[PDB]
């Protein structure tokens, strides 16, 4: 007793055995992706993950988080832990399960992508360059002056940017007949049509790189998140016409819609692609991709 591996094998490996690597894995707030809940009354997620917010975008606040996961302290507050399931969720368990390293993941404070702002970078895109967070499997759209600085890996799905507009009441139905970023109604306000975005996000530094005259209504009309711009365009008082941004974050939004009135139209266009941030110097990045290819193949992300 106690030299057997089998019977030894309680809070530790088999015999010796090389344990997961212990990665800073960061993920968004978006509840398509990671739906965001409360904690049951043992602090724990039969369901979900064990995923922390700090409500603050602090490089010593997630090393602290990291350091008490990793030991046996439990000091994290109830109020603090939340339960994070979907599909990023899945796929970073799948990642673990097929790669063995440690699927450990925070809710970033800020929630967003991370534009150009000040001069520097913010959201993930700083905590990439810091060297803080080691993986950004999430999602994740790549930008024109974003892959640059840091290294994108293979984008797992290929999502592009739709058009989210309400059908106007009216003798058929008529609805925002737009066909993307070369209309005329799109760069122009069409009889005062509002335009808004995700704030942070890669399609503000998209607009704003592009086309830098039209983004003022959209630094105005900045979001807090995507369920609740889709919940202020689902309220009567319409206070926004623009709701442009990728289709996956939005095909589940208009789903779940019992309006009828949140729909995706206009021809795909602007292939960003749902990339993933990872330092250089990194043999993993390898591995992620071969991953990724697999699961393309055999159609089990799907």
């Given at each position: 007793?106690?030299?057997?591996?089998?019977?030894?094998?309680?809070?530790?490996?088999?015999?010796?055995?090389?344990?997961?690597?212990?990665?800073?894995?960061?993920?968004?707030?978006?509840?398509?992706?990671?739906?965001?809940?409360?904690?049951?009354?043992?602090?724990?997620?039969?369901?979900?993950?064990?995923?922390?917010?700090?409500?603050?975008?602090?490089?010593?606040?997630?090393?602290?988080?990291?350091?008490?996961?990793?030991?046996?302290?439990?000091?994290?507050?109830?109020?603090?832990?939340?339960?994070?399931?979907?599909?990023?969720?899945?796929?970073?368990?799948?990642?673990?399960?097929?790669?063995?390293?440690?699927?450990?993941?925070?809710?970033?404070?800020?929630?967003?992508?991370?534009?150009?702002?000040?001069?520097?970078?913010?959201?993930?895109?700083?905590?990439?360059?810091?060297?803080?967070?080691?993986?950004?499997?999430?999602?994740?759209?790549?930008?024109?002056?974003?892959?640059?600085?840091?290294?994108?890996?293979?984008?797992?799905?290929?999502?592009?940017?739709g058009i989210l507009v309400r059908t106007r009441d009216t003798?058929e139905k008529i609805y925002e007949e737009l066909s993307?970023?070369?209309d005329?109604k799109?760069?122009?306000?069409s009889?005062?049509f509002?335009?808004?975005?995700?704030?942070?996000?890669?399609?503000?530094?998209?607009?704003?790189?592009?086309?830098?005259?039209?983004?003022?209504?959209?630094?105005?009309?900045?979001?807090?998140?995507?369920?609740?711009?889709?919940?202020?365009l689902?309220?009567?008082?319409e206070?926004?016409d623009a709701f442009?941004?990728?289709?996956?974050?939005?095909?589940?939004?208009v789903?779940?819609?019992?309006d009828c009135k949140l729909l995706t139209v206009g021809?795909?266009?602007?292939?960003?692609?749902?990339?993933?941030?990872?330092?250089?110097?990194?043999?993993?990045?390898?591995?992620?991709?071969?991953?990724?290819?697999?699961?393309?193949?055999?159609?089990?992300?799907?």
């Amino acid at each position: 007793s106690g030299i057997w591996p089998e019977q030894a094998q309680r809070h530790k490996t088999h015999f010796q055995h090389p344990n997961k690597l212990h990665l800073r894995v960061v993920t968004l707030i978006e509840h398509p992706f990671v739906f965001t809940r409360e904690v049951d009354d043992e602090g724990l997620c039969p369901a979900g993950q064990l995923c922390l917010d700090p409500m603050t975008n602090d490089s010593s606040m997630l090393d602290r988080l990291f350091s008490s996961l990793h030991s046996s302290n439990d000091t994290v507050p109830i109020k603090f832990k939340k339960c994070c399931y979907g599909y990023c969720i899945d796929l970073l368990e799948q990642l673990a399960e097929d790669m063995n390293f440690d699927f450990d993941l925070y809710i970033v404070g800020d929630g967003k992508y991370g534009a150009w702002k000040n001069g520097h970078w913010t959201g993930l895109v700083g905590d990439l360059l810091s060297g803080t967070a080691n993986m950004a499997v999430t999602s994740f759209s790549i930008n024109t002056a974003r892959s640059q600085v840091i290294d994108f890996t293979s984008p797992f799905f290929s999502t592009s940017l739709g058009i989210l507009v309400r059908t106007r009441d009216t003798g058929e139905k008529i609805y925002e007949e737009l066909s993307g970023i070369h209309d005329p109604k799109l760069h122009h306000p069409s009889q005062g049509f509002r335009f808004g975005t995700v704030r942070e996000s890669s399609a503000e530094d998209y607009v704003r790189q592009s086309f830098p005259e039209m983004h003022e209504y959209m630094r105005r009309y900045n979001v807090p998140a995507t369920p609740d711009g889709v919940q202020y365009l689902k309220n009567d008082p319409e206070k926004l016409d623009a709701f442009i941004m990728d289709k996956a974050l939005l095909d589940y939004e208009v789903s779940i819609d019992a309006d009828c009135k949140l729909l995706t139209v206009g021809k795909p266009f602007a292939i960003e692609g749902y990339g993933i941030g990872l330092p250089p110097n990194s043999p993993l990045t390898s591995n992620i991709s071969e991953l990724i290819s697999q699961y393309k193949s055999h159609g089990f992300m799907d």
